Every structure is written in C-alpha cells, then in structure tokens.
Amino acid sequence: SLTTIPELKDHLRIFRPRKLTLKGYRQYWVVFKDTTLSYYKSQDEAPGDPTQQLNLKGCEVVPDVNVSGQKFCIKLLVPSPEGMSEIYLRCQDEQQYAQWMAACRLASKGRTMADSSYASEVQAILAFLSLQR
C-alpha cells in the first residue's frame, strides 16, 4: 500500500575539480535518495531543476577526514563514458558526515538507506570519528 523511503536533505559544500570554469567550494542544497545524489543551488529549485545528479552505484567513495582539523570530506569518483567525474562533498559536523558517508558507501554497492545495515553504518562511522578525537 503506502510506503515510505528514506532521503537525506541538507546544505553541503561541494567542489568539482575538472569543471574548467573557476569555482571552488559552494554551499548547495543537496538531496540523496535511493542510490542517486542530486545537488541544487536553492531550496525553491528543488526537485525538478537539478544542477547536478549522479548515480553512485559502482563509484569509488574516498573518505577524506581530519577530525581535529574539522575536515569531514567525501570524494566521489564516478565513471562516465567520457572519463571520470569527481564530486567533493564537505559536511558541517560529525553526524552529517556519518549519515552522508554511510549513504554514499552503501549506494556505491547498490544498497539503499532502506537496507537494514544503514543505521549500524552511521553509528560505526560516528564511532570511528569519535575515537580519532
């Protein structure tokens, strides 16, 4: 009948290396559903004007972490028919990094946030971060 699917929605800071127009980290409104990440400039522009969307299934997920430096970065390496796209996500705190990273790591494997091991994945990441500090 009625079902409910989990999503992530928040503002993240994003950098795109190989976009040959100059642009560093911008705060965008970013939404994660199923195994696809979509980022937008503004909330009003959600959901049907995607500045960028990408299916993370099959991609490389590179953690880029320095807890003492308040660096919570996720590097997504997405293959394409014309080479690799890179998408760098910077989160605001440890909780946000844990949710967003758990989601990216599962999605890379084709598993969604509905998979029963997503919660233990978040909590596992939080533990990781908390013990480094």
Author numbering: 345 to 477
Article passage:
The later identification of the kindlin family of proteins revealed them to be key co-activators of integrins, alongside talin. Talin and kindlin interact directly with the cytoplasmic tails of integrin β-subunits, with kindlin binding to a membrane-distal NPxY motif and talin binding to a membrane-proximal NPxY motif. In any case, membrane binding by kindlins is thus not only an important factor in integrin activation, but may also determine their cell signalling impact and even the cell's fate. The membrane-binding capacity of kindlins has been proved to be essential for integrin activation and is dependent on their PH domains and on a long loop within the F1 FERM subdomain that is conserved and similar to an equivalent loop in talin.
Here, we report the crystal structure of the kindlin-3 PH domain together with molecular dynamics-based and biophysical characterisation of its inositol phosphate lipid-binding properties. A salt bridge in the kindlin-1 PH domain (Arg380–Glu416) has been shown to occlude its canonical phosphoinositol-binding site, and in the kindlin-3 PH domain, this salt bridge is replaced by a hydrogen bond (Arg360–Gln396) in the equivalent position. The kindlin-3 PH domain has a mixed surface charge distribution with a pronounced concentration of positive charge at the canonical inositol phosphate-binding site. The kindlin-3 PH domain is closest in structure to the PH domain of kindlin-2 (RMSD = 0.69 Å), with the major conformational difference being in the β1–β2 loop. In particular, the β1–β2 loop is flexible with both simulation force fields, in good agreement with the crystal structure. MD simulation revealed that kindlin-3 PH domain interacts with the PIP lipids primarily via the loop connecting the β1 and β2 strands, and that it has a somewhat higher affinity for binding PtdIns(3,4,5)P3 than for PtdIns(4,5)P2 in a membrane-like system. Moreover, one kindlin-3 PH domain appears to bind multiple inositol phosphate lipids, at both canonical and non-canonical sites, by means of which the affinity of interaction between the PH domain and the membrane is greatly enhanced by an avidity effect.
